[PDB]
Amino acid sequence: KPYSIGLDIGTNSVGWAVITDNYKVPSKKMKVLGNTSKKYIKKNLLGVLLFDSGITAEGRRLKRTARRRYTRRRNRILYLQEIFSTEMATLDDAFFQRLDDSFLVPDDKRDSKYPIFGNLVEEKVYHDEFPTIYHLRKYLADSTKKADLRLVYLALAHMIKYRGHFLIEGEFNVTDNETEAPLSSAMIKRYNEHKEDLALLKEYIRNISLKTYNEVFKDDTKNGYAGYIDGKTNQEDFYVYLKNLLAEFEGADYFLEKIDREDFLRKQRTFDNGSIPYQIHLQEMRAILDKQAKFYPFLAKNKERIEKILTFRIPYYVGPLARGNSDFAWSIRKRNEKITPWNFEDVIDKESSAEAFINRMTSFDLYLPEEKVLPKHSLLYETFNVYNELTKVRFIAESMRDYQFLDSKQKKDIVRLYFKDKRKVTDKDIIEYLHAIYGYDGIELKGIEKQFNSSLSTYHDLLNIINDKEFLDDSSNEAIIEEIIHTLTIFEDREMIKQRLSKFENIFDKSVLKKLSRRHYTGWGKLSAKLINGIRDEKSGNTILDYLIDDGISNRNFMQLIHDDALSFKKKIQKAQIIGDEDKGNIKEVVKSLPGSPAIKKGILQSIKIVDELVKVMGGRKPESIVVEMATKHVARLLDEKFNNKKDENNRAVRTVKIITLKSTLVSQFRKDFELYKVREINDFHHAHDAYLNAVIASALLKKYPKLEPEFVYGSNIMNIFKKSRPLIEVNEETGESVWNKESDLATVRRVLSYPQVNVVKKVEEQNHGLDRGKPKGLFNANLSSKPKPNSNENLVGAKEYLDPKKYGGYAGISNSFAVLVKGTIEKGAKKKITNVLEFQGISILDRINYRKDKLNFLLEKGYKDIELIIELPKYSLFELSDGSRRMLASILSTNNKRGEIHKGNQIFLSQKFVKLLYHAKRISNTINENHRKYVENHKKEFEELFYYILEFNENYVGAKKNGKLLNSAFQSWQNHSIDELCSSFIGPTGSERKGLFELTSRGSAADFEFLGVKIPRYRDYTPSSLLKDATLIHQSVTGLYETRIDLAKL
RNA sequence: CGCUAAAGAGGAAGAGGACAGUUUUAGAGCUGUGUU
RNA sequence: AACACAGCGAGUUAAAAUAAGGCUUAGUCCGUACUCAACUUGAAAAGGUGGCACCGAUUCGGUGUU
DNA sequence: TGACTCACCATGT
DNA sequence: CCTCTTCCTCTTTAGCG
DNA sequence: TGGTGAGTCA
Ligand SMILES: [Mg+2]
């Protein structure tokens, strides 16, 4: 029997359905391997495959660039330290050493607690004389007195460590008029104002009430000044709290005004220091180096280098400064030396690296995939475009009947006279020329509406900048012009643009040269120079451009030149293109590269895998059709490649399987007309129901009207034939062929939409990113947690391994990659007594590699004197308990084996009578449908049976009891409560995408819901040791049709 | 279905740089009393 | 000597880290992207393994056969 | 001393 | 939050296999 | 939405 696959490719789901005949999904008994007693499990061929959504690489890119910037910053400080090392060693041996051990607790510090000066008194004096670093920077910048070298290094390292934004280009040099340092003076002003205003607010809040004083200033937890300085509060929250407190108090207008202008007790380091140019820091740096150079000689020699450390930005075109082994770097080194900031010009070739940066990402031409595309603004590309549009210009003749294309000489004269004269060509100018050259008047133009899309913009621009028409006119100079446009396109920095442009300096003038240096064009074309001009045809010895400009017989567009049988352009392109044989091998490689975000790419790859395994399931008989709907078009191409690869002859490729792309509206139209409603909340069976329905629709549409088929198949709607609003049986019109029967086939459609069994599968993944509230997370939390409590049990990853997590605080939230079952012998009961213990051990993403290197050693470090088997369970591994409860194992906690997050794999099935009610309930607030209101008003008695069914399903397969009791207590108000609240409680708010009562019975993680005004907490207390007793691990396949039940008890 | 160009709209990949946030330490704790 | 109860004062900043880390790959580089049912040939590229029909549906069950 | 409960929280412009 | 670069995709126009 | 700290009971 024949069969046709259907598919629902999607971001988080792929739904697969197989139809043999008469719109029916066949049932096949699939063997079950493993230590089980169920030899054959009979599975319906409806199915779904659920996967975690693919993640874009933006977060990885942002964290990679951040990582690199921290590394480069520490390298800049190390550079300044190597500059200061020889002279500082006499002043203080361990100043750098004391700075490096600032994090450490006093005992673990190598020399002293006080970082800067190493003794209590001098540190006290430093903080007294300069309360903040900005006072120090101002003093060094403006005081012509010898400074302790430590202080100078601290100021310079403050500027290098925190330098300003580089957006402003040029040289940049406030209320203060005499100071060298503007920023230092402004922040010293903020220091003084904040101190004085703190004193005044202290007096006021204390005087009204001492309790307010204590709460605001001496209680860190609150949002007051104690929260502002020694807490997690921010300016906005502190202002809100202060205004709320101060509003009641009488006469507190000064503080309220300053808060209103957002300048009341401001902090020197604020989110508002972002808009500070680096030139301000450089102005301070120059002053400090200059004034202290006279006293310290080494500063005079290294003054240029110290500035270079601050102002050096790795150019964007010169990427990561690798020697290789880096996937992202493109830099092309010219020497072998290490890349210090001073020698970056020497070591690296900026021209070659900048050219590689653009040419690595440019696209090879499709027609002849061996050459790079021409620059978008090249004269050749425009001249190719201008003629191509101009050739097909057809003018209606006032007297002559014939509608005729432009003559070649007319094309030459038109382009010369007008296209070169004016940037924007129109219809009117061409009608004028045609009237001038030919006496006919009243001519209109075809192929051209109003302005020409094509223009020689580059010709006019280069004419003005060059200031010479003759240079553009001459064909000999055309190669020079092409090289000029190439250097403008590839190179973006004006310096290197003029550097390469200096080659063609003899022809032009320097003033013209610089003006050309300003002009940079962007973008690249989709054709190549060799194609347009290099390729030739033997019979005429003419390029494609030569034919477009002058093809005597008629004006033919570029594709017509390429495809014409007489011309050898088609032979040339085919020769080159099958020289370019890049099938890419495995389907993984081609699927990775199709257009889109990785999220859809995952769906596509899994859809190919489902189709392959479905072919294996059905006996190896290739599908009669496949119907991808994306309810992706790239799949159609990919599925065409694998299935329709075979060609009877090299001349053409035969097609056997019709990859089909139904439009989305068809499924919705069928669903609404015949009331096969979908509720996304109830169960995940809707993906499979959608796939089966579209398989049915596509089969019928191809069955009844073959005429539309060519459009529908790859390479007044049709839904009316599904509508009988007509004889009982529908048969093809104009021929005798099978068409869908109006009632009997509908019976099969509804029954297959009321099948309890759908082979739902959640792909077992070994996680690499932890998940918090749906946002990816790494190995652990990105923010260091506070120091543990004095007598609190914490599993904190240290900041660095040499730093103890207890004393120095640590990282919390270790994410678990997977969990391994370990049968073996464990010391238990403190007597080391042997036992046959089958218990999970969770493995973190942190130590995944360590586990993989030696599984036995990792498991043995955790006990397990003898290990006899290690079943390795990825996330979402499925256990079916004895009762019939399926508990997918999300993870086993790394810290504790006996705690883990277990989802619920059981999917509730609701009869059609309930599903209609639920769909109506979710759509109640919708203004469009009165029928929803009337149905929910007429069938309120369904709600009682629905609640009881959800609660019994909760009782048997789910394990929630307290939530069930709260739900039962809440439901007693069913007879009298708001119908809007009844519906929202059962299904959810309209459009919320959050389920109501069905969040108790949905698959996956449990989430909080509100039922009739009662907040029901999420049930997350499934225990990981309940899986082990009397349950069977199910190793389902990608389709889910093929499973291996490894019973844990016999194991 | 595949192309080229124009005006619109929306993404993807990559490079460079800034500001904050978090953690520990250094820079403010002192006095009277309860207390073992 | 330490823990606390009350009173009175300071509070703005600096250093270090900012995914743990890995390497003969030692770079001013890489470390959250894509890939991953089970058993079994596979160093690896890539492959192999699971009969059909019929009646029904609270998750698949029961039949007829080979 | 391990199942059965509840509460807090997490990097962004 | 700022600067830069390329590659894609969707509807519509002009030509087109 | 997943870690997991902390509390009370058989
Ligand atoms: Mg690092």
Q: Is residue A62 part of a domain?
A: no
| Sheet strands (E) in A769-815 | 770-772, 775-777, 797-798, 810-811
Chain D, protein-covered positions (CB within 7 A): 1-7, 10-13
- Separation between Cα atoms, residue A704 and residue A712, nearest integer Å: 13
Residue A67 CA to ligand 1 centre (angstroms): 6
What is the Rg, in whole angstroms, of the alpha carbon atoms belonging to chain A?
38
SS (H, E, C) A561-619: HHHCCCCCHHHHHHHHHHHCCCCCCCHHHHHHHCCCCHHHHHHHHHHHHHHHHHHHHCC
The phi, psi pair for A892, rounded to 5°, reads -105, 130
Residue A533 CA to ligand 1 centre (angstroms): 52
A705-A707-A711 Cα angle (round to 5) = 110
Please check whether residues A695 and A807 belong to one and the same domain: no
Q: Is residue A229 part of a domain?
A: no
- Total domain count for chain A? 5
Q: Find residue A772's DSSP bridge partners.
A: A775
Q: Is residue A422 part of a domain?
A: yes
A687 marked as part of a ligand binding site: yes
**If DSSP codes are grouped into helix, strand and coil, which group holds residue A956?**
helix
Domain that holds residue A560: 379-576
A629 marked as part of a ligand binding site: yes
Name every residue whose Cβ is closer than 8 Å to that of residue A753 and which is 6 or more positions away in sequence.
A676, A689, A692, A693, A912
Q: Is residue A937 part of a domain?
A: yes
* Per-residue CA distances from A197 to A131, A210, A272, A444 (Å): 17, 18, 20, 80
Residues 834-893 (A) near nucleic chain B, CB < 7 A: none
Footprint of strand F on the protein (CB under 7 A): A 770-774, 789, 792-795, 812-816, 890-891, 893-896, 899-901, 903, 1004-1008, 1018, 1020
* Documented resolution in Å: 3.2
Among A902, A921, A942, where does a domain finish?
A902
- Separation between Cα atoms, residue A431 and residue A449, nearest integer Å: 12
Do A811 and A799 form a contact (C-beta atoms < 8 A)? yes
| Closest-CA residue to A606 (of A575, A628, A625, A621) | A628
SS (H, E, C) A965-980: HHHHHHHHHHCCCCHH
| Closest-CA residue to A659 (of A620, A681, A632) | A632
Footprint of strand E on the protein (CB under 7 A): A 167, 274, 316, 358, 361-363, 373, 389, 392, 446-449, 453, 489, 492, 520, 522-524, 557, 559-560, 563, 595, 633
Place of tokens 């031409």: A365
Helix or strand run (H / E) with residue A300 = helix A297-311
Two structure tokens written together for A796: 């904190």
Among A697, A727, A761, where does a domain finish?
A761
CB-count exposure of residue A281 (10 Å: 0-12, 13-18, 19+): buried
**If DSSP codes are grouped into helix, strand and coil, which group holds residue A717?**
coil
Residue A962 CA to ligand 1 centre (angstroms): 47
Do A459 and A382 form a contact (C-beta atoms < 8 A)? yes
Strands A1031-1036 and A1043-1047 come out as antiparallel
- Separation between Cα atoms, residue A708 and residue A70, nearest integer Å: 61
- Separation between Cα atoms, residue A574 and residue A581, nearest integer Å: 11
Two structure tokens written together for A865: 């004197």
Whether A8 is catalytic? yes
- Amino acid A836 reads N
Please check whether residues A722 and A674 belong to one and the same domain: yes
| Closest-CA residue to A793 (of A896, A695, A884) | A896
Please check whether residues A636 and A543 belong to one and the same domain: no
- Separation between Cα atoms, residue A697 and residue A718, nearest integer Å: 10
Two structure tokens written together for A121: 């008194």
Among A507, A541, A576, where does a domain finish?
A576
Do A176 and A187 form a contact (C-beta atoms < 8 A)? no
Q: Is A541 left (phi over 0), alpha (psi -120 to 50) or beta?
A: left
Please check whether residues A384 and A325 belong to one and the same domain: no
Please check whether residues A730 and A608 belong to one and the same domain: yes
**Number of neighbours of residue A417 by Cβ within 10 angstroms:** 13
Q: What DSSP designation does A532 have?
A: I
- What long-range pairs does A438-446 form, CB within 8 A, spacing at least 24? A440/A397, A440/A398, A440/A399, A440/A400, A441/A398, A442/A398, A443/A395, A443/A396, A443/A397, A443/A398, A444/A395, A444/A396, A445/A393, A445/A394, A445/A395, A445/A396, A446/A393, A446/A394, A446/A395, A446/A396, A446/A403
Please check whether residues A639 and A502 belong to one and the same domain: no
Q: In what order do the strands lie in the sheet with A625-628?
A: A658-660, A625-628, A4-9, A13-19, A46-50, A759-762
A270 Cβ within 7 A of any nucleic strand B atom: yes
Name every residue whose Cβ is closer than 8 Å to that of residue A463 and which is 6 or more positions away in sequence.
A469, A472
Two structure tokens written together for A764: 């077992």
* Per-residue CA distances from A814 to A58, A808, A863, A891 (Å): 23, 18, 21, 11
Q: At what angle do helices A182-208 and A278-293 cross, to 10 degrees?
A: 110
Please check whether residues A847 and A808 belong to one and the same domain: yes
A791 CA to B36 C1' in angstroms comes to 21
Q: At what angle do helices A930-938 and A912-922 cross, to 10 degrees?
A: 130
Residue A163 CA to ligand 1 centre (angstroms): 20
Q: Is residue A695 part of a domain?
A: yes
Q: Is residue A350 part of a domain?
A: yes
CB-count exposure of residue A644 (10 Å: 0-12, 13-18, 19+): middle
Residue A70 CA to ligand 1 centre (angstroms): 7
Do A684 and A1003 form a contact (C-beta atoms < 8 A)? yes
Q: Is residue A286 part of a domain?
A: no
- Separation between Cα atoms, residue A714 and residue A661, nearest integer Å: 7
A363 CA to E7 C1' in angstroms comes to 8
Percentage helix, strand, coil for chain A under 3-state DSSP, each rounded to 5: 45, 15, 45
- Separation between Cα atoms, residue A473 and residue A480, nearest integer Å: 12
**If DSSP codes are grouped into helix, strand and coil, which group holds residue A164?**
coil
- Separation between Cα atoms, residue A334 and residue A380, nearest integer Å: 34
Two structure tokens written together for A488: 């403008």
* Per-residue CA distances from A155 to A80, A291, A342, A555, A1024 (Å): 11, 14, 22, 74, 56
Nucleotide nearest to A114 (CA to C1'): B26
- Separation between Cα atoms, residue A450 and residue A159, nearest integer Å: 59
Q: What DSSP designation does A787 have?
A: P
Please check whether residues A751 and A811 belong to one and the same domain: no
How many H helices and E strands in chain A? Answer: 41, 25
Q: First CA to last CA across chain A, in angstroms?
A: 41
Please check whether residues A883 and A921 belong to one and the same domain: no
Q: What DSSP designation does A401 have?
A: S
Please check whether residues A534 and A677 belong to one and the same domain: no
Please check whether residues A696 and A814 belong to one and the same domain: no
A782 CA to C18 C1' in angstroms comes to 8
- Separation between Cα atoms, residue A878 and residue A762, nearest integer Å: 9
Q: What DSSP designation does A743 have?
A: T
A912 Cβ within 7 A of any nucleic strand B atom: no
- Separation between Cα atoms, residue A356 and residue A169, nearest integer Å: 26
User: DSSP per residue over A64-93, as a string?
Assistant: HHHHHHHHHHHHHHHHHHHHHHHHHHHH-S
A57 Cβ within 7 A of any nucleic strand B atom: yes
- Separation between Cα atoms, residue A166 and residue A280, nearest integer Å: 11
CA atoms within 13 A of residue A633's CA, in its CB half-sphere? 8
Two structure tokens written together for A564: 């014409």
Residue A64 CA to ligand 1 centre (angstroms): 10
Please check whether residues A749 and A842 belong to one and the same domain: no
- Separation between Cα atoms, residue A919 and residue A935, nearest integer Å: 11
A337 marked as part of a ligand binding site: no
- Separation between Cα atoms, residue A50 and residue A610, nearest integer Å: 12
- Separation between Cα atoms, residue A138 and residue A136, nearest integer Å: 5
CB-count exposure of residue A100 (10 Å: 0-12, 13-18, 19+): middle
Q: Is residue A90 part of a domain?
A: no
Place of tokens 């978008």: A376
Do A379 and A482 form a contact (C-beta atoms < 8 A)? yes
CA atoms within 13 A of residue A692's CA, in its CB half-sphere? 31
What is the maximum alpha-carbon separation in chain A? 115
- Which residue is nearest nucleotide C11, judged by alpha carbon to C1' distance? A229
Two structure tokens written together for A708: 């539309």
Do A1005 and A998 form a contact (C-beta atoms < 8 A)? no
